[PDB]
């Protein structure tokens, strides 16, 4: 499957924070959208997911333009999303967090939803935290639960908005491996970060954004040697 954004634009009070942004992510690859804080990464994700109105542009899955589809319909079509900010239910256990999201799985019986929660806990290395309250978890643990929550909806594409934010250096290793596993499983992964080198290493290719504009695309080695990229990190 293919998810494409074309000519996305968004302004706040006239300030153009995303301008003429186009990108593609296909099943089975990890694609980066990388650039400094404020570059427009989250805003771009918002327009793809359906969280904020776009000022311009199109969202396309395969042959179908889904620009007019509400958030819930785009999700059904395969768009999954991990917010940058905390999204876990802090008062609820890991298990209850997962079961809450799994209630949207009308294709599964109640027992099958329970089965899926157990599978997800094992896959994300959080099954030992089944009954732990979200509030009690470390940043890294919470992030694993949040990614599991995103996956519970069975998406084709997963937009990870800074999955390493608030995660200790140690926990980052496992999350990277989980993300690599997602790609291996056939998910299309679009991942944001301000730490270019760290996240680039796990990308097959990446777009670099600066002040609302795409300035470069390529493999990690191409990006690290691109003068247009160097030019904004002087
Ligand atoms: N609701 C809003 N009103 C005004 N400005 C906003 C709003 N949301 C985001 N912005 C601005 O848009 C710019 C891009 O934000 P964002 O897309 O979150 O950047 P990034 O995720 O790349 O750090 C930021 O400078 C931010 O101040
Ligand atoms: Mg952001």
Pocket residues: Cβ below 6 A from ligand 1? 12, 17, 37-43
CA of 109 to the centre of ligand 2 (A): 36
Cβ burial of 122 (10 Å; 0-12, 13-18, 19+) is exposed
Return the ligand 1 atom nearest residue 162 CA.
21
Alpha-carbon distance of 23 to 58, in angstroms, equals 11
CA-closest candidate to residue 55, choices 43, 37, 73, 41: 43
Ordered domains of the chain (ranges, CATH): 1-234 (3.40.50.300)
User: What does DSSP assign to residue 133?
Assistant: B
Who contacts 22 (Cβ-Cβ below 8 Å, separation ≥6)? 4, 5, 6, 7, 8, 57, 214
Who contacts 44 (Cβ-Cβ below 8 Å, separation ≥6)? 5, 8, 10, 18, 21, 23, 33, 209
State whether residue 192 is helix, strand or coil.
strand
Name the structure determination technique.
X-ray
State whether residue 97 is helix, strand or coil.
helix
CA of 49 to the centre of ligand 2 (A): 14
Q: Is 35 annotated as a binding residue?
A: yes
Tokens of 117: 């929660």
Q: Is 14 annotated as a binding residue?
A: no
Q: Which of 32, 42, 160, 210 has most ligand 1 atoms within 8 Å of CB, for mutation?
A: 42
Alpha helices in 50-138 (DSSP H): 71-76, 94-102, 110-123
């Amino acid at each position: 499957a293919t998810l494409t954004a074309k000519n996305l634009a968004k302004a706040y009070k006239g300030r153009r924070v995303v301008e003429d942004v186009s990108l593609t992510v296909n099943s089975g690859e990890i694609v980066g959208l990388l650039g400094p804080n404020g570059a427009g990464k989250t805003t771009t994700f918002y327009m793809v997911v359906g969280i904020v109105p776009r000022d311009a542009g199109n969202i396309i899955i395969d042959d179908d333009d889904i620009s007019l589809l509400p958030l819930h319909a785009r999700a059904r079509r395969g768009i999954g999303y991990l917010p940058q900010e905390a999204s876990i239910f802090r008062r609820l256990s890991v298990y209850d967090n997962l079961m809450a999201v799994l209630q949207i799985r009308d294709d599964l019986s109640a027992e099958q939803r329970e089965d899926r929660a157990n599978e997800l806990m094992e896959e994300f290395h959080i099954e030992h935290l089944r009954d732990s309250m979200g509030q009690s978890l470390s940043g890294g643990e919470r992030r694993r639960v949040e990614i599991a929550r995103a996956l519970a909806a069975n998406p084709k594409f997963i937009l990870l908005d800074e999955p390493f934010a608030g995660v200790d250096p140690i926990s980052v290793i496992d999350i990277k491996r989980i993300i690599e596993h997602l790609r291996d499983s056939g998910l299309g992964v679009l991942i944001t970060d301000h730490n270019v080198r760290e996240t680039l290493a796990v990308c097959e290719r990446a777009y670099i954004v600066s002040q609302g504009h795409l300035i470069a695309h390529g493999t990690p080695t191409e990006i690290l040697q691109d003068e247009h990229v160097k030019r904004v990190y002087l």
